[PDB]
């Protein structure tokens, strides 16, 4: 789709079997969800925003639904104000930024 | 034009005087420029993301110019690591995700 920016760019995704709703956020290097469950092995990672850093669990090669487009990769799991689908996974989808 | 995620989306703005280079952002709701000492009336404001929250000063009816695209509106002046171009503006210069 072609998605405006007059609203918050929110779309419902699915992963670990269960649907979330996410912000698409292109001024994000990685993808960030809040506090949840997902299967396998994680490493303790630490990354960055506009108030400091904050500690997170890094989940590799995950299988995640954007809006009906699949992808696959890294995942962190933390203390973000809301669900985050950063730019590893927004290339994968074909998220470009038009004007 | 188009812009790519495989990097930042980082571009060239130009307010008051300067030029500066500013990052593309559909995750932020608003514009928040690093420190610089505008001219005119400001009001305090408090905005949080990952890490908690910085303080900042928000003027309003600035014109900011974006890949030689004008735009006129609220701009955050504070202690951000990077400079965010937001919604309020993206919209203006007519900037959508598309894919
Ligand atoms: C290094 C990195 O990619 N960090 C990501 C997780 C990130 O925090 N991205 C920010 C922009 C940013 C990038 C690098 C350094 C600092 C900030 C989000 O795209 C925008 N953020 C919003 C977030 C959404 C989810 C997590 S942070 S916000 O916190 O910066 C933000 C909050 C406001 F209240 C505001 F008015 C404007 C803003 F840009």
Redesign the pocket.
């Known amino acids: 789709p072609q998605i405006t920016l007059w609203k918050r760019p929110l779309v419902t995704i699915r992963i670990g079997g269960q649907l979330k709703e996410a912000?698409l956020?292109?001024?994000?290097?990685?993808t960030?969800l809040e506090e949840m469950n997902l299967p396998g092995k994680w490493k303790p990672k630490m990354?960055?925003?506009?108030?400091g850093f904050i500690k997170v669990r890094q989940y590799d090669q995950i299988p995640i639904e954007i809006c009906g487009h699949k992808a696959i990769g890294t995942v962190l799991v933390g203390p973000?104000?809301?669900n985050?689908i950063?730019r590893n996974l927004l290339t994968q989808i074909g998220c470009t930024l038009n004007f």
């Open positions: 912000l956020d292109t001024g994000a290097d990685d960030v990354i960055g925003g506009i108030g973000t104000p809301v985050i950063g």
